[PDB]
């Protein structure tokens, strides 16, 4: 038996990171009034979304 | 002959320098984007009869 020496090391390293993100708003406001001499009206809406 | 040379070889080592090697290669790549737009609309009427 022949035997050699080959003492040897080898490493390798990868690693990968990510991160990703995403965002969105959207509002809305309405505001209405109605007037009459004997009569007065008043309508609100509000909307949000995320 | 040739399975002679493929089993031990053409030729025989006659000059041989004696060592340590060591390497190291290494790499990094980063990116980061980011972007955002808003919007924001107004719209108002006021009305007026007798």
Known sequence: ?50 | ISRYFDRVGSHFLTGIVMGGRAILASSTNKLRVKRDYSVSVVAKASYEGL
């Open chain 1, 1 to 50: 038996v022949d035997v050699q020496q080959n003492d040897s090391a080898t490493y390798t390293n990868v690693s990968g990171n990510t991160i990703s993100e995403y965002q969105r708003s959207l509002a809305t406001s309405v505001a209405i009034e109605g007037r009459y001499n004997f009569f007065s009206g008043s309508l609100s809406t509000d909307f949000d979304s995320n």
